Amino acid sequence: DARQRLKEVEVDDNGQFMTTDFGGNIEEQFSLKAGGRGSTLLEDFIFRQKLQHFDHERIPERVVHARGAGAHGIFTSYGDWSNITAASFLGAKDKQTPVFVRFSTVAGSRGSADTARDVHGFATRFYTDEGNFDIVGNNIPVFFIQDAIRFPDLIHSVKPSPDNEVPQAATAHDSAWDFFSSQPSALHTLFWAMSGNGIPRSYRHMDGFGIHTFRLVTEDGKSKLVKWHWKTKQGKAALVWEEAQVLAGKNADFHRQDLWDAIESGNAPSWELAVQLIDEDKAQAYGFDLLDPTKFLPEEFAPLQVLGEMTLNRNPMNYFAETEQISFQPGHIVRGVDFTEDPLLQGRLYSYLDTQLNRHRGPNFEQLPINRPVSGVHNNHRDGQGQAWIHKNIHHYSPSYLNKGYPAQANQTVGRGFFTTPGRTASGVLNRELSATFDDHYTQPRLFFNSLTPV
Amino acid sequence: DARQRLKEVEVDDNGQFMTTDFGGNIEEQFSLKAGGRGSTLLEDFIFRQKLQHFDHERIPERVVHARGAGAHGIFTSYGDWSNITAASFLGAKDKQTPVFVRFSTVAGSRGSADTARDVHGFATRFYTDEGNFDIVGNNIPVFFIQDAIRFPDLIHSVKPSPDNEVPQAATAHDSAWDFFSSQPSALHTLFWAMSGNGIPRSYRHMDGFGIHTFRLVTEDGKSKLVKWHWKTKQGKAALVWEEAQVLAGKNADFHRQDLWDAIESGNAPSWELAVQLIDEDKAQAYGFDLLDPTKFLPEEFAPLQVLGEMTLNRNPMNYFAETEQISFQPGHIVRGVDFTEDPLLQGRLYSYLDTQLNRHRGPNFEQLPINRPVSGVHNNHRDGQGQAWIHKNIHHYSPSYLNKGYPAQANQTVGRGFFTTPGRTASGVLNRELSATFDDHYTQPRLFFNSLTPVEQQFVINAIRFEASHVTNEQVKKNVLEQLNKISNDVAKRVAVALGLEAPQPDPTYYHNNVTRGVSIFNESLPTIATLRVGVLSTTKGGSLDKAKALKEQLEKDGLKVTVIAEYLASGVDQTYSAADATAFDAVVVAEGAERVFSGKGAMSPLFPAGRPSQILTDGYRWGKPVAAVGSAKKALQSIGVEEKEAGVYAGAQDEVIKGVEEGLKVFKFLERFAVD
Amino acid sequence: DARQRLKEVEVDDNGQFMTTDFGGNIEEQFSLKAGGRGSTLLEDFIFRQKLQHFDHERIPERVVHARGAGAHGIFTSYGDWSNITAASFLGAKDKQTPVFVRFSTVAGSRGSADTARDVHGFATRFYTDEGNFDIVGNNIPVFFIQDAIRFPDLIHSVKPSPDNEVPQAATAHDSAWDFFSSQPSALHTLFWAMSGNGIPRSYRHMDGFGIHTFRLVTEDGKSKLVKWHWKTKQGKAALVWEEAQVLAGKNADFHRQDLWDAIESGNAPSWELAVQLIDEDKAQAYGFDLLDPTKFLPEEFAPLQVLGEMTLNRNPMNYFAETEQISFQPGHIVRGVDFTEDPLLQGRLYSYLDTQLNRHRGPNFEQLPINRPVSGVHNNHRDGQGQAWIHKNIHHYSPSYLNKGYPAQANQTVGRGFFTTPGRTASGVLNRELSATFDDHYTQPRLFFNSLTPVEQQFVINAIRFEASHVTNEQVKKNVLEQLNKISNDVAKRVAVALGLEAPQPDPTYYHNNVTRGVSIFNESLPTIATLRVGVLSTTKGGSLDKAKALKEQLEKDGLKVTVIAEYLASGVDQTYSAADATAFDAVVVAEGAERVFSGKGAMSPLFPAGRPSQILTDGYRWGKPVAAVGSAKKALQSIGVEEKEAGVYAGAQDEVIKGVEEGLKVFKFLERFAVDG
């Protein structure tokens, strides 16, 4: 059972008497009144504790990918991949790691239709024995823009016009196509979103991609460039637009219900995790720059190598507590993986940590049940809103004689610590530019178009 | 201009260089990097200030009524109403007061469909010269429950299931109908929501109600019980369900766009503010208790008095800042109005103030431009998150020698202070009960149902049939039938058919034949067809487009919004078949020559989905719209099995067709097209 | 009026009726109740809107520098400095720019005492016509640590122990000295905090520093390394510890009141803005790395060059809205200034933007009146909690055909845009290390100590003796001595005495005898005694009060703030003995006739605590103040064993006393009254 660890915070109300949030049994179907047809009393503590909680139920939706659904499951490694990565979850044949996956659209707000035409999110958390590792991906291998500082421009242009907040969950309006034509890098992802990827049959019928080139790093520090892929075992399938539109009104919940039903009926969907592995010296070998997230790597140059399989076989118990509250971050990285100088990825690392502050209104969101790692948290962080723990170590600083040196530093050689790829270097002037290697915005959109059937 | 006071906070960026939020000109299209293909620097303050602001754009949606849209306007009093109220905004003939109104659904989240079936909100703020007065109403005059403490139960049951968060913006699921049948008070509002009130044609075509009995109070403290009514000058109009569903997918923004377009085109919508006034001693004299919000007062007993008129004539400039941020409260009351002991109202007073803390994350939300009164704020409140003012008075307490007694106390007799109705008393034991006078949950649902036309009753029945057939639990369905049967055996029998159940035997305790006026929608034609929409189906082949252009010009004379549709965007074409759907239009007319796209190859261009032109005409017809064809276009009507002798179907020469369509648009929906049990 | 732009948000309540926050006149002194002795009603909207606002008044205090106070002013450039910087606020002679400055301690929470021993903040905002530029500095030129990532370690170790939250506003506890000795970079700032800089007489008597090397950049991209200095026109002056402690109890608001009073009295304080300017090629030329914030640049290698002067001349109208809410950031930079690769500075850039989210609970804090620039904000940012504007541009993205390209990109060549120094480069491997050029943690602490006067050095030793004696852990105390020994064997030995330990043997690796100017407080007299405070000890009996009044009038002629003290508030009396303490005054003078309250019946009034007048005079003397007595009042001096021949002790006729006190106040502290080891 992938949700096993969440049992300890599950609350069973079967056969129980109603209480306040501070205990004590109550009734809460009648306001306390001053006489038979009297006004409600301020001293009705029961009324106020019940309505205060209700009044405060909502939290801000995700700034993007607000509409989505998720499930728990298990990832299984098909081998000991230590020759390519120090990553613990990939370190032994048949090793199992719990996952949670959230799928989504991008533009629409939380109540928008599943079958809007859009890019789709495909975000996976591996709760590894060496910390949470997230692959925060989409169902399309390339993204609209080449530098993260342009993300608010893209998103503003695609989201509803700011005067009237029209249209919902749709790129079909002036500002979006103004941006797409003004910022041609966007043309590649656009073509993908205008294909079947824009209107998938179900989350279970989507492939997934990390998009960016990352690095796999072995114990000794040798690195390989990597593209992450999820290959659906259910096969890719897509609707037609005229159909998607009607479905958007007839069942806005088409995709979330589809996933829920598949899992509930014992038809758990699966995906194989596959990588494309490229030597560092081939970063600019394939007619484009592998640091450029507007390009994908044709499989002719690098076949998909299968590492393992993920199966989603447990629905959440409470959607809000689990699916709504889960906070993904590409910055959730573990020993054996590293970033690259992809200027889009770079900025994401900042935004996903920062945005949690808005959505969770406090610094302690990793303490939420769905966000907790399985591997233990030991550091000198204290306090902050909603601090859910009580720390024993009163010498909450390093270095220190008084705490005997614990918690202790970990690095490449000691304690299985994270470490940046040792050979990475910086060179050249500090600049607010992009590489000329990023300049071709049309060749791959053409490649993609060429590779589809006539219809 | 209703938005006049907002101008001072408007920001124009035309002709300016980009800046940070702390000033200084910048460029912000490239991250600062260490080397040509290097990593981004933490010292890129430009990147972080821009992305931080983006990262934090969202605020919590409203806990209920999250999906909505609003506009600014002006309220004008028809009289000096001092004989019934001290309320300043009603104190003189022709007196004008700025308003903002937000309309909404209830259950759905932020981005759910406008044409979901639901109760609808109708919240009005009067920015009076004696403070902000809000009437936070709905488009249905009664509410589901009798005591505010039950609101989370109601809302929890209607909103999506908490395990999978399905279904969005829908009462058509087990939990909702479990609550409706377990808490029978809910049956009255339920019937309203299952009627045309649940699927209005637009915000402009709704009435509004305060629901609760309130009090109007004069300067000397004389009070009357009052019900607030907004009477639409556009007339009530509603969709049919099978139409509303497609519209939910084809255009989730139907109502917000409709409102926006009417205002921008200079067709500002209006409502008259009306009241029923009741003597205090008759609170319990009309067959129910006026403190009970699940009942309305039949106008036969107390006719409407018209106090004035509201027109909404200005769209917001920034939706988030105005519409999203505005914070309504039933506790926003002014001198001349008071509360009653309605236990639903009583709890709202607490809820709306408190919930603002969640949505705005601080106590200073009243300082936001859209929330600010126009009448001046002087008190000893200080500090709090986002404090936007700088207070001059350093002796921020009362009483005080040092501040010379300012700000000063205001009451009934000094400084036009608010005052609670002087006659009001408390009597009896502190209790967690409800008055036995609240006990009848079935008589008024029956009254309502009795007062609908035969097809309109059929719509309610078919809505219940549709909804309850979604309930998976057999006993809940049985529970629902048992409750329905207490209202009407016939209603229960007809619903039972769909559910494949036997309806209980008649239970006549609450049965009766009384009817009341003013609750129907389909019994009355529209007062005006201005703004209504005509889709003209044409084609780029032959002379059809020129003829379509002529038709459009004539129709527009009548204030109609006309869309000419063709295979592609040729000169004079407003929309392609691919982009078009019958749901966007109130009438469908086939222009002469367009019959060519209704069969064979002409109906199978790569430019649109197969059969699209036929589907539009079929949908138009089946959903009860005025449909028509000019000249040889009659063949399109023939192709879908329709005959020009039918009500709301028009054929012949252009002049004939234009006149017929314009007539049919007043009728709006042709109910002869819907089968009755 | 520096506060001019803020007038439009000022709210006047005089002559008005009470209202709710949503308008409508009310009364709010009685809850609405069901019957005469009845319960309060939930429908009392008046009660709730009033209590809700109250309930929510508080916002988180600053995570550091929580205790502080500020004021508005004007900075005036002395020149057109375009030859060294493109910065507009420095672009022309006599060009004026509004400022706001907040001064503070570091460790203490709100409400902690002004006169705790601590580093002090000195944060200045220039509201320039090209955006807000903040110099977020301290009153000490070096910081404890070399990399921003270590800040939570430093701060956790200095702030109260996390089990019991003791002690408030103090480094005098185990964890702090554990950290100072475990992280030797800290020793330099520690020495400064243990000197007079740790207990300044007032905010007005502090110098200020940006600490970090920054860059000045001209229009054509040429750069210079720079150190920011604020030089106080009032002179540096410090308390003594035993006085600071009593003052912390007698008036926790000593410094905030001092600033407020100086401004209200028309004695606005001033500071000159000065820079040290050195070429890029000097970064590693002076025996340390200029990217290392634990080192200062000796003025002998690069003199101060004065750029202008700021004067603080307007108090806030509402402390919360202005002083509490103001949000400083070192990332508030403008065209003509750039950052350096100082790894402490680098991380601050992140921290100060992020922390505002905590303190203001939303992303629109730059919209608060005190945070708004004067120069205009035009960008595509929208929404966020508490959005206070209504944007007109509906095409809130770039690039765009629909918005016609506005708002437009600005850079080095178009639109006076910010730009990073064109010549900056990066070379080498990505690393989680520090340059070996940062390795010397002891040479500059020694340089500083060397540069103090003998008594001034003793104060540093006595501060360390006091602090380290509070460390309960024996090994931490030994660790401290081992580290001190690396700076100075003599320092280590003298400290060791107090701890009853044996100092290690000399370790001469870093020892040296060099000295540098500009770091001493006590080696120079005050340039002015304006605003300084004289307590005149009098009595209501006899003719003392009339003479005290005469004394007061003469003293006030020299710009002094005079307090006549007596047993009760008679005509002419400013403060009672009960309410008075020597800590409040820079000078103590017994008026003729007042000797009667130093012994005999007059000294036993129930109107003040036993011994009160003698104690004030005793405290004043022992704390090194000029003390005096007029005429027969010399008996008062005699009663406490003090002799007229002593430096800073004056007696005789009124004329002579006034003259000597006024000269003594320039010396400020009489260091001959403090014993030195040996």
Ligand code: HEM
């Ligand atoms: C290859 C490019 C990108 C991919 C594949 C991607 C994917 C995703 C996905 C799947 C989610 C939803 C995670 C969930 O289900 O909760 C998400 C959310 C988000 N994304 Fe991205 N995104 C990309 C680019 C960016 C960029 C450039 C930025 C900003 C620099 C950004 C900022 C955010 C933020 C702030 C959220 C909301 C996170 C939360 O509230 O928990 N994304 N993205």
Ligand code: HEM
């Ligand atoms: C006659 C019965 C009711 C009517 C007519 C009504 C109407 C409305 C309307 C129109 C809005 C949306 C205002 C807007 O557009 O922003 C709203 C929001 C809200 N309502 Fe009600 N409601 C009723 C019952 C209740 C009850 C019993 C409660 C709780 C005790 C409640 C709590 C709330 C809350 C917390 C909001 C969100 C307000 C905000 O976030 O600004 N309502 N209601």
Ligand code: HEM
């Ligand atoms: C040369 C080194 C430093 C100096 C001169 C300095 C100075 C100051 C000053 C004067 C303040 C108070 C500003 C005010 O009056 O509102 C302050 C606050 C603050 N400092 Fe620093 N500090 C330094 C190092 C650091 C570092 C390394 C960090 C973190 C990496 C840091 C983080 C903060 C934070 C988060 C605040 C609270 C700001 C606010 O809440 O508005 N400081 N600092």
